[PDB]
């Protein structure tokens, strides 16, 4: 004869929302890898990054004499026409974060004193990129070191 419960939250989050979210979520994350970011979400993160990067640059000594600054796609795009170009990303906001290097490249080319094949072999360019990331760690100066 007796009736124990109605459990309105369960009825309202199963009926109105076609799922059962009120469950321990450990079973999902351990068993299944986290889902990738949606296309819409990607646009939002990029907008935030550009503003943050600009601040880091300005309240610090920087050189516009031989450099080029790019705020596009949250990538630094700091390059010199003569010898090289670099593109960066900083995950951190106000808190100081070691400068992170996405890619380092060299712009000098001569086919003939090589031979049909570029001046530096990708092993060495992988090697150079890590060395830079090393000096930056101290991070005394953002763009002068």
């Amino acid at each position: 004869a007796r009736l124990p419960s109605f459990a309105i939250p369960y009825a309202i989050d199963v009926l109105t929302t076609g799922s059962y979210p009120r469950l321990p979520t450990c079973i999902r994350d351990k068993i299944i890898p986290p889902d990738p970011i949606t296309k819409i979400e990607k646009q939002a993160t990029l907008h935030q990054l550009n503003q943050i990067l600009r601040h880091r640059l300005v309240t610090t000594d920087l050189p516009p004499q031989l450099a080029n600054l790019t705020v596009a796609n949250g990538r630094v795009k700091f390059r010199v026409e003569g010898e090289f170009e670099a593109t960066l990303t900083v995950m951190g906001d106000d808190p100081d974060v070691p400068w992170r290097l996405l890619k380092l490249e060299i712009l000098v080319e001569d086919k003939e004193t090589g031979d049909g094949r570029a001046l530096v072999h990708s092993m060495q360019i992988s090697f150079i990129h890590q060395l830079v990331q090393s000096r930056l760690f101290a991070d005394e100066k953002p763009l002068q070191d």
């Binding site: 090589g114 094949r117 001046l119 072999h121 060395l131 000096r135 760690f137």
Partner: peptide, 25 residues
């Protein structure tokens, strides 16, 4: 069920770079 034999120079520059710019970690 390749190398174009120019690493006998670029290597030297890297050494001159490493000898002049030690890692800071």
């Amino acid at each position: 069920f390749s190398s174009i034999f120019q690493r006998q120079r670029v290597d030297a520059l890297l050494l001159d770079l490493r000898q002049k710019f030690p890692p800071k970690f």
